Amino acid sequence: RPRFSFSIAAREGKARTGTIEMKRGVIRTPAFMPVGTAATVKALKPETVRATGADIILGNTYHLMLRPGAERIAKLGGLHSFMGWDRPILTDSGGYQVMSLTKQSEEGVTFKSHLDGSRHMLSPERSIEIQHLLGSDIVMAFDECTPYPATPSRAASSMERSMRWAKRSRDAFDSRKEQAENAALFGIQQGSVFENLRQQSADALAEIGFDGYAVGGLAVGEGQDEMFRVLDFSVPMLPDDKPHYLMGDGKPDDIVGAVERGIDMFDCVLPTRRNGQAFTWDGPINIRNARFSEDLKPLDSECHCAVCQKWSRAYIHHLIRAGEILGAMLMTEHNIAFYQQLMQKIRDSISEGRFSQFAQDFRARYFA
Amino acid sequence: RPRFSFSIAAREGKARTGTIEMKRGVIRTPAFMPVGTAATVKALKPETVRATGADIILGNTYHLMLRPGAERIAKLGGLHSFMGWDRPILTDSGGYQVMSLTKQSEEGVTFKSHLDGSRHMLSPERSIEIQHLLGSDIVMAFDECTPYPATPSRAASSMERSMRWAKRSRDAFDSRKEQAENAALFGIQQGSVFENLRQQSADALAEIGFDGYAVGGLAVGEGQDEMFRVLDFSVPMLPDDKPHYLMGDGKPDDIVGAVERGIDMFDCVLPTRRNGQAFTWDGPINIRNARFSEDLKPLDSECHCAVCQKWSRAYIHHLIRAGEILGAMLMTEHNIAFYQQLMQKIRDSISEGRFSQFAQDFRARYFA
Ligand SMILES: Nc1nc2cc3[nH]c(NCCN4CCOCC4)nc3cc2c(=O)[nH]1
Ligand SMILES: Nc1nc2cc3[nH]c(NCCN4CCOCC4)nc3cc2c(=O)[nH]1
Ligand SMILES: [Zn+2]
Numbered sequence: 001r002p003r004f005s006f007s008i009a010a011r012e013g014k015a016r017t018g019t020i021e022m023k024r025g026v027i028r029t030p031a032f033m034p035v036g037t038a039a040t041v042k043a044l045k046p047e048t049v050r051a052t053g054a055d056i057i058l059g060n061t062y063h064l065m066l067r068p069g070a071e072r073i074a075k076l077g078g079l080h081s082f083m084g085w086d087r088p089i090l091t092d093s094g095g096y097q098v099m100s101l102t103k104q105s106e107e108g109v110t111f112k113s114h115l116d117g118s119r120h121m122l123s124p125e126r127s128i129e130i131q132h133l134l135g136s137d138i139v140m141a142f143d144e145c146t147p148y149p150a151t152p153s154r155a156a157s158s159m160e161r162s163m164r165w166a167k168r169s170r171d172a173f174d175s176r177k178e179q180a181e182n183a184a185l186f187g188i189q190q191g192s193v194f195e196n197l198r199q200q201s202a203d204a205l206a207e208i209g210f211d212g213y214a215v216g217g218l219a220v221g222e223g224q225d226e227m228f229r230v231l232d233f234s235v236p237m238l239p240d241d242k243p244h245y246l247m248g249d250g251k252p253d254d255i256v257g258a259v260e261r262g263i264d265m266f267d268c269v270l271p272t273r274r275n276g277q278a279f280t281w282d283g284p285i286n287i288r289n290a291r292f293s294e295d296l297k298p299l300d301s302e303c304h305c306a307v308c309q310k311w312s313r314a315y316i317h318h319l320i321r322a323g324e325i326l327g328a329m330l331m332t333e334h335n336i337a338f339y340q341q342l343m344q345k346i347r348d349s350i351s352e353g354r355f356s357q358f359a360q361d362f363r364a365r366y367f368a
Numbered sequence: 369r370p371r372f373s374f375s376i377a378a379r380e381g382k383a384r385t386g387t388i389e390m391k392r393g394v395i396r397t398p399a400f401m402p403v404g405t406a407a408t409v410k411a412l413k414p415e416t417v418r419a420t421g422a423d424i425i426l427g428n429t430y431h432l433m434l435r436p437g438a439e440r441i442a443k444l445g446g447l448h449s450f451m452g453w454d455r456p457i458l459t460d461s462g463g464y465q466v467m468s469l470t471k472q473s474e475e476g477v478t479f480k481s482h483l484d485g486s487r488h489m490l491s492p493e494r495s496i497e498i499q500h501l502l503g504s505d506i507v508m509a510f511d512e513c514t515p516y517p518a519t520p521s522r523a524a525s526s527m528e529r530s531m532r533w534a535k536r537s538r539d540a541f542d543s544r545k546e547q548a549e550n551a552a553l554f555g556i557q558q559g560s561v562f563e564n565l566r567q568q569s570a571d572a573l574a575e576i577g578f579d580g581y582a583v584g585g586l587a588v589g590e591g592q593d594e595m596f597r598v599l600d601f602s603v604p605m606l607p608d609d610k611p612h613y614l615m616g617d618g619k620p621d622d623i624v625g626a627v628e629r630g631i632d633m634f635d636c637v638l639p640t641r642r643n644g645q646a647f648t649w650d651g652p653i654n655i656r657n658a659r660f661s662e663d664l665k666p667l668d669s670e671c672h673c674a675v676c677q678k679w680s681r682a683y684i685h686h687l688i689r690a691g692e693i694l695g696a697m698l699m700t701e702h703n704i705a706f707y708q709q710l711m712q713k714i715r716d717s718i719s720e721g722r723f724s725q726f727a728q729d730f731r732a733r734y735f736a
């Protein structure tokens with residue numbers, strides 16, 4: 001396989017389906033990428049993550065640099081070896097998490113760890129270096145995420161800094177031959193909810209040139225209507241022939257609408273982030289609800305996951321109420337498997353030119 | 369398979385190896401039974417428990433009657449169906465846990481739940497009924513566990529009550545035809561550390577007649593030397609042709625010494641009860657220790673478990689330090705697998721008439 005090759009096999013409106021080929025594997029798109037915060041997808045062995053249908057998982061520069069440490073992971077052979085996942089890994093650049101979980105400048109950001117108050121630094125150069133030490137396959141440019149709401153002036157300043165940092169990210173990545181030859185680099189579009197700023201950002205990123213393009217700065221409190229409105233004009237600004245990655249915690253309905261608007265890749269803590277919510281084709285349920293205490297049906301009536309083949313709502317209800325680890329294991333496996341089945345139905349429907357109908361049928365039932 | 373058949377295939381001194389055949393499966397002895405408190409062996413799917421080599425698991429009348437409820441489990445099809453373990457299950461009678469986690473009389477005990485302060489009752493009859501509702505394969509007689517230390521008078525009174533309750537347990541079990549025909553009933557020897565009381569207890573239990581005999585009232589603070597001393601005289605008092613079950617939280621060394629003294633069955637929360645302790649042939653280690661932070665070796669150098677085939681000490685160290693659920697999953701699987709490999713080595717060595725040598729070699733290395 002090549003370092004990076006994105007091929008579009010079929011289209012319907014703005015929606016696309018295809019594949020990203022990389023050295024460690026093929027990624028089917030549109031793709032859902034389970035999140036593996038501290039070098040683990042919570043409550044799942046990598047083999048289980050793979051069995052649900054995942055082609056790629058996400059790690060994070062911020063969390064891993066704090067614990068167990070980027071240099072330590074490199075000494076131990078890299079993230080893939082460390083956690084036992086041998087397929088592609090995308091790593092976020094740490095920008096969002098630093099400002100979510102501090103001294104900022106044009107050079108980068110210095111901050112105190114939320115774990116032990118130790119002092120750390122991140123810059124475009126250090127972020128790219130950390131992602132190298134982890135051995136990431138898809139490296140994200142280091143950006144400044146703009147808070148919502150943002151004034152046009154502040155959104156502009158932040159976007160402009162992010163574009164300067166995008167060029168610095170590009171150059172740092174390219175100067176490291178092992179990384180440049182084996183990994184891919186994605187740029188991140190900023191500009192808040194403003195069409196002109198989004199256009200300037202897209203133009204800057206395309207001029208620099210990246211392997212893929214993320215839409216950043218959304219899923220930060222603006223709500224679905226606004227997010228979809230911004231996607232309507234923002235995604236077409238990005239190079240058509242490269243993958244488009246929406247950063248943020250998308251519900252099933254977010255994913256369907258985003259695919260309708262040209263997004264190819266998604267992450268989400270939501271299905272992982274044990275709190276009792278299980279996804280079904282008839283909408284989410286909270287398994288803690290007393291109504292499930294004697295319900296012998298599986299979490300979802302159609303789901304082909306191992307959890308729905310073997311255990312009842314009643315059992316999972318009991319486990320979650322009792323705070324048992326197996327409850328988190330079963331809920332997480334089902335939810336990630338559900339998301340993957342959603343992606344498969346999306347891919348198949350686009351391939352067959354019936355995605356618009358699928359989206360309508362999905363929404364009618366999910367929100368009935 | 370029959371309701372119950374214990375066959376001894378080989379012997380060495382007081383040690384025995386053989387099989388218990390029951391309707392739901394064969395149990396190889398000496399046996400280690402993983403503990404499944406709230407209808408789950410903590411952090412493991414039943415398939416994983418089976419893969420480690422377990423033939424039977426333990427449940428508890430006390431915990432299950434409180435949550436999710438015995439009648440509820442029966443309505444849902446029984447414990448096996450509920451949790452997805454189709455092999456034999458032994459259930460403790462609830463006696464110990466009530467007094468560990470209250471109004472006592474000759475009729476039984478009434479108590480408040482430690483979960484919600486709701487009031488409950490246990491008696492020989494109710495305990496046997498609950499074990500029936502769960503669908504237990506090996507049912508334990510309801511007893512009164514004697515605190516350590518105990519005066520000879522108090523040990524005698526408690527032992528005598530336990531023997532009266534043993535007869536009541538026997539009669540309750542026999543009067544329920546479905547239970548009598550499909551399950552087995554074990555009696556529990558009491559008498560604290562006193563040889564005469566242990567003899568009286570053994571005689572009473574043998575006169576009533578049971579499918580197996582537990583040595584109760586040990587592992588309650590007396591220490592290994594004293595426990596072994598009491599086992600020295602107590603086990604030979606029990607019928608030779610039935611299984612002998614030591615109740616309590618045995619370390620690997622406890623198990624080896626107890627087998628040397630004629631015990632056939634063991635339970636233990638120890639390998640399950642995530643706190644960082646991993647068993648190895650060179651003794652236990654605590655994976656949280658900083659010395660393991662960059663150790664690429666598996667938990668144990670010889671262990672054939674899936675954890676030791678795939679992940680390093682360094683990774684498991686990180687997971688446990690970070691409080692990640694996968695850490696508990698991996699530690700638990702390894703520890704239960706280690707215990708099963710210990711049991712296999714014990715069974716093989718007795719079969720080959722070299723158990724005494726195995727015990728010596730094991731101790732020399734484990735305590736080096
Ligand atoms: N580098 C970078 N990373 C991003 C990550 C984002 N995540 C979100 N929204 C989801 C936030 N989740 C909610 C659930 O808890 C974890 C955080 N929105 C995000 C936006 C960005 C971004 O603009 N840049
Ligand atoms: N019915 C019955 N059950 C028993 C269970 C026993 N368990 C122990 N010792 C181990 C105690 N563990 C220590 C770890 O935490 C859980 C309790 N000692 C035990 C003794 C008995 C007993 O005499 N009767
Ligand atoms: Zn499912």
Ligand SMILES: [Zn+2]
Nearest residue numbers: 671673676702
């Ligand atoms: Zn192991």
